[PDB]
Design a protein around this ligand. Structure first.
Ligand SMILES: *[C@@H]1O[C@H](CO)[C@@H](O[C@@H]2O[C@H](CO)[C@@H](O[C@H]3O[C@H](CO[C@H]4O[C@H](CO)[C@@H](O)[C@H](O)[C@@H]4O)[C@@H](O)[C@H](O[C@H]4O[C@H](CO)[C@@H](O)[C@H](O)[C@@H]4O)[C@@H]3O)[C@H](O)[C@H]2NC(C)=O)[C@H](O)[C@H]1NC(C)=O
Ligand code: 0G7
Ligand code: NAG
Lengths: 284, 259, 36
């Protein structure tokens, strides 16, 4: 009866206020609402505090509503998912002390150009971070420190030129890393650490293949089967790996995983393997 | 595992995969005995004859897996090694006597439907279950055939394999190999006159040989896949490290340091 | 001195714990009876 659509299944409520030209939240929606969709509205400015009630709200969708100012006021101790993608944010909202239960944060496609110091300070129990499509150029040392449980990190389509040598410190559970389509030319010393990365996307970058592109040289070699090329959703990037997608100077026929360091220092430290032959034969 | 079958989900929760970081390859198998202790074969880490010598920093431990190669979302757990302990009297020079090694995870692992510890044999359980004819069970992602020579069929499975094998009496074990046997190992497999087949194979080492107590219904790890000559060859038997006999050395390191 | 996990060991969540038996554990159980 309101302006939105109210539904259910189990002890959860789901309200859908998409594309309803709203400039604020349609007052008095089920107090037991768990999911809230306010997509494609006109919330140039929004107040979290305005949701203080509905104490069973877990998922909040404020995408495509051209938001430029989010007022982080009240608390949503049960909010877990938060989509702020496709908006006009120019500075990242400090959601630490406000959304303790958050596990998924998508601030993809906004107008972020850099990240605050203690950006994520507080949301330590976070699992997925989406920042694809912004214009970030550099990252803070310890940006993920507060988020040790992180499993997925998307930094594709940004203007990054160089990554913090110790960005990935901690992150024992990280499995997907999207960095495609940036302006990266080299990878720091021990950037990937000892951790195993199932799905990495590094294509669409101008990799400067010299003598300090060797670390990343062997890494590509070892993780050849873990490098994929992003196509789109529903695809499940678990379809045919492709380490050749990472190319020198983004130059086609110049895969980084096939670049002899010719006259480079230390003839045995970086990319010193490939000593024996192997003949594998697995099945369906 | 040769002549085995695909394992059921969570059927061998204690199954551990010994992963090599670079190049990325499955080396051996192993088993979980506690939230921070793994048990595998010694020669999986050290084998001077084949200049094999893996240090903590060269490996990873994948736990709670089913598929041999697919990363499994929120099913498997990847842990790093804090310390490797190979039996100080492991005989690599001749017959891999005391083929055993303990690994200490850098951080404890939480259990799940897929990740659980197996029990180690005690005085009575060892004496009760280790009898010729009684069947044990071996699991592993190892080769499905002798891969060093041309043979029909695939080399390694896509899913963890399982096979049930009868414990063979020493005499039969001894005279089936020219390799010198010790009290620290035992062999198992079907005899030429039994009809059924099955045996471990390369890549299966470290994997556990487990038996279920008919008394308390708990699964105990009686052995560790150690060696054999060929895979599932008539009149030939697989040899496993006798876990119980080495119980005193396990206890001694496991319980050595505080925490 | 410690490990952690025993007393609970050897009991599979998806099986013993749910009082379910896997497809071939019987093979093992029938092996404990003299086969003549
Ligand atoms: C399996 O692999 C291991 C390596 O993968 C083998 O161990 C390696 O052995 C060499 C010995 O040749 C070690 O050499 C360096 O360390 C020794 C000191 O040893 C002790 O302290 C180390 C910590 O610093 C530990 O890592 C060791 O385990 C041990 O406790 C130093 O004395 C050496 O210095 C020498 O060389 C430098 C030049 O670099 C000179 O300045 C010195 O004067 C001296 O001559 C080395 O720095 C090596 O560290 C060690 N690596 C590891 C991981 O332990 C292991 O032996 C092998 N197992 C078998 C049976 O082969
Ligand atoms: N048919 C079997 N059940 N085979 C089990 C072999 C398991 C395998 N082990 C092996 O391949 C070990 C290493 C040395 C040679 N070897 C063997 O199994 C061979 N018996 C040769 C040998 C025996 C005794 C002493 C020295 C050499 C492994 O760890 C995995 Cl790659
Ligand atoms: C990022 O690169 C794009 C593409 O050329 C450009 O339009 C934009 O101005 C760059 N952003 C910054 C902050 O440099």
């Amino acid at each position: 009866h309101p302006i939105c659509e109210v539904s259910k299944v189990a002890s959860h409520l789901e309200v859908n206020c998409d594309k309803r030209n709203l400039t604020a939240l349609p007052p008095d929606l089920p107090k037991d609402t768990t999911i809230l969709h306010l997509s494609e509205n006109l919330l140039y400015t929004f107040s979290l505090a305005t949701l203080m009630p509905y104490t069973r709200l877990t998922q909040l969708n404020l995408d495509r509503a051209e938001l430029t100012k989010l007022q982080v006021d009240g608390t949503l101790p049960v909010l877990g998912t938060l989509d702020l993608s496709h908006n006009q944010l120019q500075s990242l909202p400090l959601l630490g002390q406000t959304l303790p239960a958050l596990t998924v944060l998508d601030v993809s496609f906004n107008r972020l150009t850099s990240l605050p110091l203690g950006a994520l300070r507080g949301l330590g129990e976070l699992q997925e971070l989406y920042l694809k499509g912004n214009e970030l150029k550099t990252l803070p040392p310890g940006l993920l420190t507060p988020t040790p449980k992180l499993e997925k990190l998307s930094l594709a389509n940004n203007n990054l030129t160089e990554l913090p040598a110790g960005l990935l410190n901690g992150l024992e559970n990280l499995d997907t890393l999207l960095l495609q389509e940036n302006s990266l030319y080299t990878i720091p010393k021990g950037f990937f650490g000892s951790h195993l990365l199932p799905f990495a996307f590094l294509h669409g970058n101008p990799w400067l293949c010299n003598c300090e592109i060797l670390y990343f040289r062997r890494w590509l070699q070892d993780n050849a089967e873990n490098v994929y090329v992003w196509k789109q959703g529903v695809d499940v990037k678990a379809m045919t790996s492709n380490v050749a997608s990472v190319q020198c100077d983004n130059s086609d026929k110049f895969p980084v995983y096939k670049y002899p360091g010719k006259g480079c220092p230390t003839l045995g430290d970086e990319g010193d393997t490939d000593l024996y032959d192997y003949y594998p034969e697995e099945d369906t | 595992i040769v002549e085995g079958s695909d394992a059921e989900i969570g059927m061998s929760p204690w199954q551990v995969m010994l992963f090599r970081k670079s190049p990325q390859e499955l080396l051996c198998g192993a088993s979980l005995i506690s939230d921070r202790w793994v048990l595998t074969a010694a020669h999986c880490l050290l084998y001077p004859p084949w200049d094999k010598n893996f240090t903590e920093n060269d490996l990873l431990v994948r736990i709670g897996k089913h598929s041999r190669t697919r990363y499994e979302r929120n099913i498997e757990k990847i842990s790093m090694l804090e310390k490797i302990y190979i039996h100080p009297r492991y005989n690599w020079r001749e017959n891999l006597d005391r083929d055993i090694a303990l690994m200490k995870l850098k951080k404890p692992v939480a259990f799940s439907d897929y990740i659980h510890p197996v029990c180690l044999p005690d005085r009575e359980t060892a004496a009760s279950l280790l009898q010729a004819g009684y069947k044990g069970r071996v699991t592993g992602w190892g080769n499905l055939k002798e891969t060093w020579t041309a043979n029909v069929g695939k080399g390694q499975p896509s899913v963890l394999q399982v096979v049930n094998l009868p414990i063979v009496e020493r005499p039969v074990c001894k005279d089936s190999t020219r390799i010198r046997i010790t009290d620290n190992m035992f062999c198992a497999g079907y005899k030429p006159d039994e009809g059924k087949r099955g045996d471990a194979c390369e890549g299966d080492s470290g994997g556990p040989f487990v038996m279920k107590s008919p008394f308390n219904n708990r699964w105990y790890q009686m052995g560790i896949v150690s060696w054999g000559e060929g895979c599932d060859r008539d009149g030939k038997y697989g040899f496993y490290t006798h876990v119980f006999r080495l119980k005193k050395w396990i206890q001694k390191v496991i319980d050595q340091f505080g925490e | 001195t410690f490990g952690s996990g025993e007393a609970d060991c050897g009991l599979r969540p998806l099986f013993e714990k749910k009082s379910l038996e896997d497809k071939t554990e019987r093979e093992l159980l029938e092996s404990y009876i003299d086969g003549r």
